[PDB]
Write a protein that binds this ligand. Structure first.
Ligand SMILES: CC(C)(COP(=O)(O)OP(=O)(O)OC[C@H]1O[C@@H](n2cnc3c(N)ncnc32)[C@H](O)[C@@H]1OP(=O)(O)O)[C@@H](O)C(=O)NCCC(=O)NCCSC(=O)C1=CCCC=C1
Ligand SMILES: CC(C)(COP(=O)(O)OP(=O)(O)OC[C@H]1O[C@@H](n2cnc3c(N)ncnc32)[C@H](O)[C@@H]1OP(=O)(O)O)[C@@H](O)C(=O)NCCC(=O)NCCSC(=O)C1=CCCC=C1
Ligand SMILES: Nc1nc2c(c(=O)[nH]1)N[C@H]1C(S)=C(S)[C@@H](COP(=O)(O)O)O[C@H]1N2
Ligand SMILES: Nc1nc2c(c(=O)[nH]1)N[C@H]1C(S)=C(S)[C@@H](COP(=O)(O)O)O[C@H]1N2
Ligand SMILES: Nc1nc2c(c(=O)[nH]1)N[C@H]1C(S)=C(S)[C@@H](COP(=O)(O)O)O[C@H]1N2
Ligand SMILES: Nc1nc2c(c(=O)[nH]1)N[C@H]1C(S)=C(S)[C@@H](COP(=O)(O)O)O[C@H]1N2
Ligand code: SF4
Ligand code: SF4
Ligand code: SF4
Ligand code: SF4
Ligand code: SF4
Ligand code: SF4
Ligand code: SF4
Ligand code: SF4
Ligand SMILES: [Mg+2]
Ligand SMILES: [Mg+2]
Ligand SMILES: [W+6]
Ligand SMILES: [W+6]
Lengths: 166, 653, 170, 653
């Protein structure tokens, strides 16, 4: 009836920019574990600019094979953030959340199989925590038909038909 | 393979523009560990005493500590070394932050600069790619300002930049090197960097850094984090907040500055203000500090956040920690608001915040006494604050009178003459000390002032309490969980030590107890400075997470070499002795090892002679302070003993 | 050298009117402007007057999977929503998906039109789009909207199901 | 299909808990347009005059304007209609924000509530899904507070909520309905909502809303946006900022309140303070306003941002626009800081900020005069501010004296007797007016006060300037680009109109010119209230983007019906006449159509008689103010004429 979603709570107002999280996450995922560390291989990467007072831990999210047509850049409460500044994607546009040598995508898996997230453990100031709740998964084949009708309207029956055959 | 160290250095000839990667000798790691130790080895056998500080043959070395770039908490220090233009002795200078770990992730343990670039340049390192770039467009820019321009230029937002300001470019003898919230501050290392035409060193690294025994190493790291948590739940009882816990002095978090303002001297280390710290002052400085402090921030991989971003109205943001919060305020008899404003200017110029305020206060005592004339200060404003700002600008440009003052109080007075030397009353080995003029001779402090190769008291003290508890029961509680002592005798010394009576200073602790204490305190500093460990978690505070019992385990698990407590004590003795030898070779002797004449109101010349005599004996030095042929041989420093003999420094038998 | 475009969003100038959702959806009706529907907008405003949060979010890249962990920020005293800055057309929420089909939506900067319409209707000037040349080559695999739409149905419903339904519709 | 309107309404019987979707008659759209017009049709033929305001047969109707949910700028108004508990006439009440567009996207044009729920409930609409939910857990909560709890409950963060506060639950006769930065404020509509046991109406819609001619419609919209840009670059010359541009009165952006504070009456519409607006006051209120104002914010699809989030220390945030900024301040002879604080409380209780401050000031004039005793005010604090807060709480609970005052000044005085009626000196048709007591009879305003079915002067004025320019050349510049006039004669009237002399009021404009002006001004309001268009871009400011020439094009492109300027004038006349008929059927006559006795110092009874005589003639009414059988027939309102005759309201021939 329902599933568990886990939420990384990030209190950027408590972050001191130490990057301890990058150290421990990369070290844990070395092979064998703790054999080396390398913050370029961390699944958490901290946006850090003391002169803008910005300290934003960012977690690696979903893989995308292509960049956006337009990249977003925010001003919020007087802070000018970076282009794509909050994005979690392993994206062809930058090196974040990609192996520094191969370029393959990295994804945070909440230190799956470990007793607790290592980045949360090593954040001695407590900027980070993970919590859970139950949510109701979906009910929907009507949606499929409405969606194909929509693509036929935007692109035409002959274009949609030849495309589905491939 | 090698572990913890990368095993490689960069050798850069700025005259030729040549760059070379060179493998290091692993034997040097066993002997001298890393960081300061291997810097001292390089300086000894490549920089003979005829080399002048601004000659092309003087070396400027940036070293990452042995364990920098590993997961060890707070292990992130850069050690800069060169021959000092002010003291003409070795200068080593530590910088925290993020730069040394980045150099390790790029693949290097040191960069060694020789020669001089004809044109202002900066060095750009990205992993294997290393190149010299033109920096003429950066001429004069402040050290932080420079970092930000370069990072945009190169499109390297995650690069770490160590840069000089105008003061370093103009070879001011107390110019620093600045990197984010971190500074290689003292001994003139920024002047040597400017002399070589080097504006900045920019590094980006994304390679792996390996340790030898992975589970044992991360195990030790976790033990450190647990000890940090526990220690911060248990501040040392009855000690002021700025010093009761871990970290550099926690001056950015604490607003109460009674101890500093009422016990330290204002002006040119001149004036005690016994009752400065009133209600009005406390509330006024708290208001300034609350408004100015943007965020408490840490160095790399540390939870202590000793430093702070500081934002003054109408001024660019800068970063501050520890005592420069007060040095400008106090040298100028002013307030905290003035301190934070001028410190912004001085930080961008890249000046030592210990010597610079005293050089300016020294200046105005000369102008005051008439030894300097008003005509030496063209356009000198009326206001006192405005005078400090005026003189700051004259100094960083070596303009007129600024040109003399830029050499520090020792050289400036010597040049000025006319009894100016009387007012350069706070130097040791030509180097300005803390503005402290106390009543009773302290026998532990006497030894540290005389012999400390950093020539800075805040960088040799720490592991033994600064003062005794009045009540025995407080002493018993303290030594109870004092696991960091090398030996039980240190507990017993502290248990008998009392503020007043027959067990009080200067007569107790005894001469032998004082030598042991100073030796232990110093040793921990040398170990930090070789490993790259912040002294904030080791040699500086009482009861640190890192100490002589677990450090050998970090070294063995990290670097994969054999290490135990005795071998570590001996390694620390080895390169501390080599640093001593280098300064002996440059002319230093017992005669140079004396605090300022007026440092204490009550002096005891026979006790002071016996202290230094016994301390030299402990070190295994001459009664002239020279390491003996016997002790050199025992340390594997036979080549030093051979050269001393050949140079007439030691007499064969 | 190639061109990259940046959507500049001054969230401090935003007044939460949502005109931008009105015009984007209107233009993408079929035929253009025959209707509108904020839920079909490729720009969607996070709007909570009581938190003083007004943040225009532009639709970005399709993902067929949810992340293992969702993120939620406190920044400068403000408690933002879970995934509150994510551009993704993602199965965990309705944002940037067609309200009746779940088909992905993606901003293309009103491609082919004289100018971005949200920006034109944002009369306070919270939105702008600028351009710059970069040296980095584009490594994107450029799939068409049509191809992305179908591929998403096929993941959700099955290649044979989708193909069969399509034959029965043409 | 139908366009712009969705073609469906929800009929809810709260007694039975039945809910029914019903298709509407498209013929009603051609005749009565939408919004207020089709509300008036529903009320006429379903609510006969024997129905009392708190009987289950009274209807409460929420209507979205015809063009709400289309891309037309600022077209977002809800029109709430019912029989008013205070006036016993029709009450219609407009609400901006986001709620009416959401109802359209859900698929509905109106919700019609009949009956009464035994238990407190709220209605929850999500597209096709409609259900009545228990609200007992929300009993007493403030209107905004309630919205936030529901949205969390339902997990519908994008839902729009219209709710009542405790004042509505306790049937206070001037209780409002609140939705974000929007309020259906006046006539007691919140009291009827509370009577029916209805706590809130929650709606979420995600369906498409279609227009008939897509390119022509968006074309017109763009023309409006261009006109807005240009108009805001050209404020009306020599008009105060709060009224010189587009939007509701721009009181949230402007700090200068000299016109209001020096021309409007303080207290119980009692006191002119000619020289209130000093330097000290200006600076003090500016300080309050700068601190309190968090952000200027718009309604749906509008750039004007007339409203503001307001944050007072220690109080929850609320939203404000226009004149309630000052009404509490002024009724209590206080300051702006007091105004913003009590307005927070009153907004959460859901009270009309026009009548409520006057009811409390009326109260204290009674206590003052001794007509009320101190014993009627148990525990009445000393401080004046604290007295307003005290009395506010007594009123929203109908507690003791509050129970009488909760009925408004007209009923409260009538109940109280003892010459209390003398102090209810500012009512028309039992409804409190603006606190304005001027010197010279204004013949245009006289007509609007007498005949306006909203019984509120700020909701019938606007299209014709409030005062003449002194210089002819200013008048010539103004009429130059005045495209919004229906006829050239309106330019010529304004050109001859002067502040002083033979072309000044009350004698000029002439009686015929005044009737034409009032008719045009009113007509534009009725058109707005049928379409859902904010009066901020239409009927309220000088020279609006929407006007009688392009509105027919919006209606034809949007809704797909035939429309031109003449047909639109006639439609507006049709349902404005139907609103008149409804009030006639409830007992209203010429006798009720007179301003307060003391509204002007100088009165002209022969001129006032001729104005009303001529205005009735223009409307096509009786000299008793009743629409004639002839004019009813011409408007397609024959069924009204038939019923008037049958009821003895009209005499057959
Ligand atoms: C500095 C300090 C307060 C000195 O304490 P006190 O003021 O007590 O010492 P005092 O002035 O010598 O004597 C006062 C009075 O007592 C008398 N008297 C003395 N002994 C007596 C005896 N046995 N019996 C009887 N009487 C005895 C004296 O004659 C005198 O009497 P008077 O009024 O009649 O003239 C204490 O913390 C200390 O000693 N620190 C360690 C040394 C040091 O310099 N540490 C700081 C290093 S920098 C640092 O760490 C940082 C910098 C930057 C930020 C980071 C940290
Ligand atoms: C209100 C107003 C400033 C009144 O202007 P004034 O002060 O000048 O008018 P006054 O008081 O009548 O007379 C002054 C003196 O001149 C004299 N005098 C008169 N005529 C004379 C003549 N022909 N010749 C010679 N003398 C003539 C008089 O006898 C008197 O002399 P006194 O000192 O000896 O006693 C003006 O804007 C107006 O006309 N408004 C329209 C009506 C209205 O109610 N509008 C408000 C609607 S609500 C609204 O808008 C909002 C609400 C909430 C927020 C959003 C907006
Ligand atoms: N290894 C090491 N850590 C050290 C020191 C030192 O001498 N050695 N000095 C300490 C002090 S007193 C301070 S104020 C800070 C200086 O930080 P910074 O050098 O990055 O400016 O480093 C602390 N950490
Ligand atoms: N410009 C600058 N100078 C400074 C400081 C600093 O942070 N910035 N720190 C002071 C303090 S508290 C200490 S301990 C020393 C450390 O000297 P070092 O950087 O040469 O090791 O520098 C002093 N001078
Ligand atoms: N169609 C229409 N729009 C209108 C009005 C009106 O009466 N009818 N009142 C105007 C005024 S004078 C004000 S202060 C605001 C009130 O906005 P609110 O109803 O959302 O609280 O709406 C403005 N828009
Ligand atoms: N609670 C409340 N009462 C209010 C207001 C309001 O915004 N909130 N607006 C005032 C203004 S400026 C006007 S023009 C009228 C609007 O009348 P209406 O809401 O009945 O249509 O209400 C007044 N009373
Ligand atoms: S360890 Fe914590 S304080 Fe340090 S950068 Fe990471 S999230 Fe921030
Ligand atoms: S980093 Fe994220 S927001 Fe930027 S282009 Fe890539 S997918 Fe889009
Ligand atoms: S939860 Fe684990 S996987 Fe995710 S960033 Fe933290 S340490 Fe890495
Ligand atoms: S203890 Fe303080 S100075 Fe040392 S690393 Fe940690 S934060 Fe930096
Ligand atoms: S149009 Fe502009 S201000 Fe209005 S909601 Fe969109 S971005 Fe914000
Ligand atoms: S919405 Fe974005 S951040 Fe949230 S789970 Fe989906 S892809 Fe991840
Ligand atoms: S640029 Fe065009 S496609 Fe992108 S959000 Fe704005 S209106 Fe929609
Ligand atoms: S003009 Fe003002 S009140 Fe009218 S819709 Fe726009 S913001 Fe709302
Ligand atoms: Mg330093
Ligand atoms: Mg309203
Ligand atoms: W320090
Ligand atoms: W208003």
């Amino acid at each position: 009836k329902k599933r568990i979603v886990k939420t990384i709570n990030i209190d950027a107002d408590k972050c001191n920019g130490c990057r301890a999280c990058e150290v421990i996450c990369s070290a844990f995922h070395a092979m064998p574990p703790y054999s080396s560390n390398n913050p370029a291989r961390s699944r958490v990467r901290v946006v850090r600019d003391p002169l803008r007072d910005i300290y934003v831990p960012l977690y690696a999210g979903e893989y995308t094979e292509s960049e956006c047509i337009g990249r977003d850049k925010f001003i919020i409460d007087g802070k000018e953030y970076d282009e794509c500044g909050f994005c979690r994607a392993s994206c062809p546009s930058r090196d974040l959340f990609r192996e520094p040598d191969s370029g393959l995508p990295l994804k945070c898996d909440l230190c799956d199989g470990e007793p607790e997230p290592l980045c949360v453990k090593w954040c001695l100031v407590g900027a980070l925590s993970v919590t859970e709740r139950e949510v109701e998964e979906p009910d929907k084949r009507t949606e499929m038909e409405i969606g194909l009708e929509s693509l036929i309207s935007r692109f035409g029956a002959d274009v949609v038909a030849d495309t589905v055959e491939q | 393979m090698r572990y913890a160290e990368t095993g490689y250095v960069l050798e850069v000839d700025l005259t030729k523009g040549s760059i070379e990667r060179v493998a290091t000798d692993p034997r040097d790691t066993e002997l001298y560990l890393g960081g300061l130790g291997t810097n001292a080895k390089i300086l000894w056998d490549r920089v003979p005493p005829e080399v002048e500080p601004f000659s092309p043959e003087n070396l400027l070395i940036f070293a990452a500590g042995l364990l920098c770039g590993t997961p060890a908490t707070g292990c992130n220090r850069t050690i800069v070394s060169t021959v000092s233009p002010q003291t003409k002795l070795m200068a080593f200078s530590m910088m925290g932050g993020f730069w040394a770990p980045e150099l390790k992730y790029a693949g290097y343990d040191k960069i060694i600069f020789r020669g001089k670039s004809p044109e202002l340049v900066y060095l750009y390192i990205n992993n294997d790619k290393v190149e010299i770039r033109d920096a003429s467009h950066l001429k004069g820019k402040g050290a932080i300002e420079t970092a930000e321009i370069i990072k945009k230029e190169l499109n390297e937002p995650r690069a770490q930049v160590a840069a000089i300001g105008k003061a370093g470019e103009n070879r001011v003898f107390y110019a620093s090197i600045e990197q984010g919230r971190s500074s290689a501050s003292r001994g003139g290392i920024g002047a040597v960097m400017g002399d070589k035409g080097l504006k900045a060193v920019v590094v980006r690294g994304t390679k792996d850094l390996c340790v030898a025994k992975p589970e044992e190493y991360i195990g030790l790291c976790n033990e450190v984090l647990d000890y940090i948590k526990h220690r911060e739940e248990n501040p040392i009882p009855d000690v002021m907040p700025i010093l009761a816990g871990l970290g550099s002095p926690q001056e950015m978090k604490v607003h109460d500055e009674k101890w500093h303002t009422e016990n330290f001297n204002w002006g040119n280390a001149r004036t005690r203000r016994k009752d400065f710290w009133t209600d009005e002052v406390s509330h006024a400085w708290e208001k300034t500090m609350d408004k100015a402090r943007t965020r408490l921030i840490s160095c790399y991989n540390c939870p202590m956040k000793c430093g702070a971003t500081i934002s003054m109205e109408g001024l660019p943001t800068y970063m501050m920690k520890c005592f420069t919060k007060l040095t400008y305020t106090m040298a100028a008899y002013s307030d905290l608001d003035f301190g934070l404003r001028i410190a912004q200017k001085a930080t961008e110029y890249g000046l030592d915040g210990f010597s610079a305020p005293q050089v300016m206060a020294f200046a105005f005592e000369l102008l005051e006494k008439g030894i300097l004339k008003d005509s030496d200060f063209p356009g000198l404003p009326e206001g006192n604050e405005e005078r400090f700002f005026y003189l700051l600008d004259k100094i960083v440009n070596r303009d007129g009178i600024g040109d003399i003052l830029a050499n520090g109080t020792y050289w400036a007075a010597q040049e000025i003459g006319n009894g100016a030397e009387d007012y350069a009353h706070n130097n040791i080995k030509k180097h300005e000390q803390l503005p402290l003029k106390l009543s009773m001779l302290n026998p532990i402090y006497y030894l540290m002032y005389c012999t400390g190769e950093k020539i800075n008291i805040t960088q040799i003290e720490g592991q033994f309490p600064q003062a005794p508890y009045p009540k025995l029961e407080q002493r018993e509680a303290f030594v109870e969980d004092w696991i960091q002592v090398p030996d039980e005798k240190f507990k017993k010394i502290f248990l008998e030590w009392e503020p007043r009576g027959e067990k009080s200073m200067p007569n107790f602790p005894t001469v032998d107890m004082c030598c042991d204490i100073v030796d232990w305190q110093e040793m921990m500093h040398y170990i930090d400075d070789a490993l790259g460990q912040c002294a904030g978690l080791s040699s500086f505070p009482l009861k640190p997470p890192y100490h002589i019992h677990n450090y050998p385990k970090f070294i063995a698990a990290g670097a994969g070499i054999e290490m135990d407590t005795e071998k570590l004590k001996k390694a620390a003795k080895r390169y501390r002795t080599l640093v001593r030898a280098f300064n002996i070779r440059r002319g230093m002797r017992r005669v140079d090892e004396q605090p300022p004449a007026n440092h204490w109101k009550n002096r005891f010349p026979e006790l002071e002679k016996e202290l230094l005599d016994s301390y030299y004996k402990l070190k295994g030095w001459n009664d002239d302070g020279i390491p003996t042929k016997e002790t050199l041989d025992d340390l594997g420093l036979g080549y030093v003993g051979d050269e001393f003999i050949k140079r007439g420094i030691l007499s064969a038998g």
